[PDB]
């Protein structure tokens, strides 16, 4: 099966009587889901993946742009991306796969899992958890220009409220637990140097903050207290929200080979958000 770029189709369980943007978009763009599809596990097969060169990501990005540029209530719904006639999607089943190189347990499917297309910076919300241990993924770890996508194995709840001023609460215990596991994984990759975190250092104003959309309202939260009982982040709005933090986008500082490496929250290339969900998939021509 050659790898092939083709135009995917989408499937969802949107409702046609519902006014919210994602349902309206999916009702015209997508077909109904197969509620119970079969998955063929491929015995003895190995295939090479490259999550950083995956035309599925480009396609999802265009679709999500279309959704936002189409449009009330705004709650992301699951969208499946699906291989058209003559094609299939290969799914990597290796539970600690770095997204590049060989994968052993592979299965073929017509569609991805249902992905919520959540638009956010710094923290990945409401996504897929790693099945086993925390996983970190980068295109090249020794290039500090390449962002690191972290996938957590346990969700961290983030609850946000408004009183223009607003805040988000995170459990301090759970967050310190999450940072410890991330540190262990970063050391494996950086010659067991000491790991430091620091707040975002620049870029567009919405990437220096944790920014996200909470049913209609755009929230911009200061994450210094996360990267430096509950942790309360101050936010500006430009209504309650509870989400699961399921991942992080990090960037490593450049410089001299000190005894330490420092990492900062980043993001802004929404294509990394889509990679964090699509890393295990690849389109092939079956014919």
């Amino acid at each position: 099966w050659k790898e092939a770029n083709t135009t995917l189709f989408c499937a969802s369980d949107a409702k046609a009587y519902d006014t919210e943007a994602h349902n309206v978009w999916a009702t015209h763009a997508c077909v109904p889901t197969d509620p119970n599809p079969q998955e063929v596990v491929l015995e003895n097969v190995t295939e090479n993946f490259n999550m950083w060169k995956n035309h599925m990501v480009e396609q999802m990005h265009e679709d999500i742009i279309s959704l936002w540029d189409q449009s009330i209530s705004f709650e992301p719904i699951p969208i499946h991306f699906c291989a058209p006639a003559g094609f299939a999607i290969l799914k990597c089943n290796d539970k600690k796969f770095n997204g590049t190189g060989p994968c052993t347990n592979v299965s073929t499917v017509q569609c991805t899992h249902g992905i919520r297309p959540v638009v956010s910076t710094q923290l990945l919300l409401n996504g897929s958890l790693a099945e086993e241990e925390v996983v970190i993924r980068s295109e090249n770890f020794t290039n500090n220009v390449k962002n690191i996508i972290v996938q957590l194995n346990e969700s961290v709840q983030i609850n946000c409220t408004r009183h223009r001023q607003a805040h988000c609460n995170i459990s301090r215990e759970k967050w310190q637990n999450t940072l410890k596991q991330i540190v262990k994984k970063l050391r494996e990759q950086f010659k067991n140097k000491t790991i430091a975190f620091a707040p975002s250092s620049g870029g567009d104003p919405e990437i220096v903050m944790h920014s996200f959309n909470c049913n209609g309202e755009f929230f911009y939260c200061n994450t210094t207290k996360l990267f430096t009982t509950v942790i309360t982040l101050p936010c500006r709005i430009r209504i309650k929200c509870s989400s699961n933090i399921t991942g992080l986008l990090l960037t490593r500082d450049g410089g001299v080979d000190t005894t330490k490496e420092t990492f900062r929250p980043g993001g802004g290339n929404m294509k990394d958000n889509w990679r964090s969900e699509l890393y295990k998939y690849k389109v092939v021509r079956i014919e």
């Epitope: 742009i65 936002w68 996200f212 755009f218 802004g268 929404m270």
Partner: nanobody, 126 residues
Framework: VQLQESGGGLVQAGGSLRLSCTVS????????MGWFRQAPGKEREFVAA????????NYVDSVKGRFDISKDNAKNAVYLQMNSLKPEDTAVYYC????????????????????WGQGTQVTVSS
């Protein structure tokens, strides 16, 4: 290709070129479009950007007063007028797009753009 640049050429210092980029990919009111360039041997650097909806612009200091970035939304087009060209302007010029759905300002980004063209080659002699 999503983005395709044209207008590159060989020019004499003090001359002018006009670069064009047609954006075949999906655009939106929260996009920025820009131009970046890479001179032989050196790293890629920002040149100019424009907000797709608002038209706010930004330039690298070494082109101010000489380069102008403009757009035509109905043609999905962005343009870089380059006047008073200097040998230091010699480079591959890339058009780029960035979707910024969460932006709260019209000022365009100068880094980390979603996708890039193949580039158009510019040589400025003398």
């Amino acid at each position: 290709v999503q983005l395709q640049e044209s207008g590159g050429g060989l020019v004499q210092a003090g001359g002018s070129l006009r670069l064009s980029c047609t954006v075949s990919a999906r655009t939106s009111s929260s996009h920025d479009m820009g131009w970046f360039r890479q001179a032989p041997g050196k790293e890629r650097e920002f040149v100019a950007a424009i907000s797709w909806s608002g038209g706010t612009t930004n330039y690298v200091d070494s082109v101010k007063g000489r380069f102008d970035i403009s757009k035509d939304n109905a043609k999905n087009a962005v343009y870089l007028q380059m006047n008073s060209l200097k040998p230091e302007d010699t480079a591959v010029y890339y058009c780029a797009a960035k979707w910024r759905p969460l932006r709260y300002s019209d000022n365009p980004s100068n880094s980390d753009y979603n996708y890039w063209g193949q580039g158009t080659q510019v040589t400025v002699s003398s």
